Write a protein that holds these residues in place. Structure first.
Motif, PDB file in Angstrom:
ATOM      1  N   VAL B  14      28.401  53.649  55.413  1.00  0.00           N
ATOM      2  CA  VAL B  14      29.617  53.867  56.195  1.00  0.00           C
ATOM      3  C   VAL B  14      30.075  52.562  56.836  1.00  0.00           C
ATOM      4  CG1 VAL B  14      28.513  54.608  58.366  1.00  0.00           C
ATOM      5  CG2 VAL B  14      30.835  55.375  57.833  1.00  0.00           C
ATOM      6  N   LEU B  36      36.826  54.286  61.617  1.00  0.00           N
ATOM      7  CA  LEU B  36      35.462  54.802  61.450  1.00  0.00           C
ATOM      8  C   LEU B  36      35.196  55.946  62.438  1.00  0.00           C
ATOM      9  CD1 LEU B  36      32.159  52.824  60.879  1.00  0.00           C
ATOM     10  CD2 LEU B  36      32.304  54.619  62.603  1.00  0.00           C
ATOM     11  N   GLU B  40      34.948  59.539  60.773  1.00  0.00           N
ATOM     12  CA  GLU B  40      33.534  59.808  60.500  1.00  0.00           C
ATOM     13  C   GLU B  40      32.744  60.343  61.681  1.00  0.00           C
ATOM     14  OE1 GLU B  40      33.194  59.584  57.367  1.00  0.00           O
ATOM     15  OE2 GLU B  40      34.904  58.262  56.947  1.00  0.00           O
ATOM     16  N   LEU B  41      33.345  60.365  62.867  1.00  0.00           N
ATOM     17  CA  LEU B  41      32.664  60.918  64.040  1.00  0.00           C
ATOM     18  C   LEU B  41      33.557  61.960  64.713  1.00  0.00           C
ATOM     19  CD1 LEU B  41      31.097  57.603  65.380  1.00  0.00           C
ATOM     20  CD2 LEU B  41      29.819  59.612  64.548  1.00  0.00           C
ATOM     21  N   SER B  42      34.370  62.637  63.906  1.00  0.00           N
ATOM     22  CA  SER B  42      35.364  63.586  64.420  1.00  0.00           C
ATOM     23  C   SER B  42      34.754  64.800  65.120  1.00  0.00           C
ATOM     24  CB  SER B  42      36.279  64.059  63.288  1.00  0.00           C
ATOM     25  OG  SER B  42      35.577  64.879  62.367  1.00  0.00           O
ATOM     26  N   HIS B  43      33.468  65.068  64.892  1.00  0.00           N
ATOM     27  CA  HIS B  43      32.813  66.196  65.571  1.00  0.00           C
ATOM     28  C   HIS B  43      32.008  65.768  66.799  1.00  0.00           C
ATOM     29  CE1 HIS B  43      33.920  68.444  61.942  1.00  0.00           C
ATOM     30  NE2 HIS B  43      33.336  67.486  61.245  1.00  0.00           N
TER      31      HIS B  43
END
Ligand SMILES: *C[C@H]1C(=O)[C@]23[C@H](O)[C@H]1CC[C@H]2[C@@]12CO[C@]3(O)[C@@H](O)[C@@H]1C(C)(C)CC[C@@H]2O
Ligand SMILES: *C[C@H]1C(=O)[C@]23[C@H](O)[C@H]1CC[C@H]2[C@@]12CO[C@]3(O)[C@@H](O)[C@@H]1C(C)(C)CC[C@@H]2O
Ligand SMILES: [Ca+2]
Ligand SMILES: [Ca+2]
Ligand SMILES: [Ca+2]
Ligand SMILES: [Ca+2]
Ligand SMILES: [Ca+2]
Ligand SMILES: [Ca+2]
Lengths: 92, 92
Positions: B14, B36, B40-43
């Motif tokens: 990533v 990023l 990739e850290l949307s949760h």
């Protein structure tokens, strides 16, 4: 979940599995760390077969000096490994 | 590969994907770090929609002060997130 998110959870999972075997359920003692390395890092690190290697690995990772590897110390270990591999794979 | 090993590779993957978009291919500039985090850290992290948030996040992560996030700084960020989640999930 993204690949990065799944990776975060995997790190927590593997630490949980090994730290919870004996004693303090949130720290890795020597035997727990040894088995984590031997079972879960078998492609990255040479298998540990000697007490002196167990000892030196714990000594290196145990920055707060309590004789065990806690989560922060485990993350520092993961960072060491990942950084080595990053440099290897990127030719850094 | 073990789950732990696959996690190590995912972290490298990533970072590679995002750092290589613009400029220095081995560091994240503000725009790369923002994407990023958002993709990739949307949760785990609230979506970044404000320049001031981008700025503060980079300021916090950029410990060597060169205006970008390198791999070591990225690993420190991953450690922050993973430690927060470890404490959340283990009730630590
Ligand atoms: C990313 C891992 C990897 O592939 C390594 C290490 O385990 C770690 C980074 C450095 C790699 C080695 C040493 O052991 C490896 O398992 C192996 O793949 C690499 C070889 C091929 C032995 C070359 C040296 C390099 O340091
Ligand atoms: C492990 C992540 C997580 O589930 C969190 C954070 O993103 C991170 C640790 C702390 C969790 C929260 C805050 O946001 C979360 O996404 C969310 O699941 C958690 C709630 C439910 C909002 C409770 C607070 C906790 O700090
Ligand atoms: Ca334990
Ligand atoms: Ca310790
Ligand atoms: Ca500690
Ligand atoms: Ca870049
Ligand atoms: Ca920097
Ligand atoms: Ca640096």
């Amino acid at each position: 979940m993204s690949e990065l998110e799944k990776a975060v959870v995997a790190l927590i999972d593997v630490f949980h599995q090994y730290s919870g075997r004996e004693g303090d359920k949130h720290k890795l003692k020597k035997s727990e760390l040894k088995e984590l390395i031997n079972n879960e890092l078998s492609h990255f690190l040479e298998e540990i077969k000697e007490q002196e290697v167990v000892d030196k690995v714990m000594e290196t990772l145990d920055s707060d000096g309590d004789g065990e590897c806690d989560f922060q110390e485990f993350m520092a270990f993961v960072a060491m490994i990942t950084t080595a591999c990053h440099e290897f794979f990127e030719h850094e």
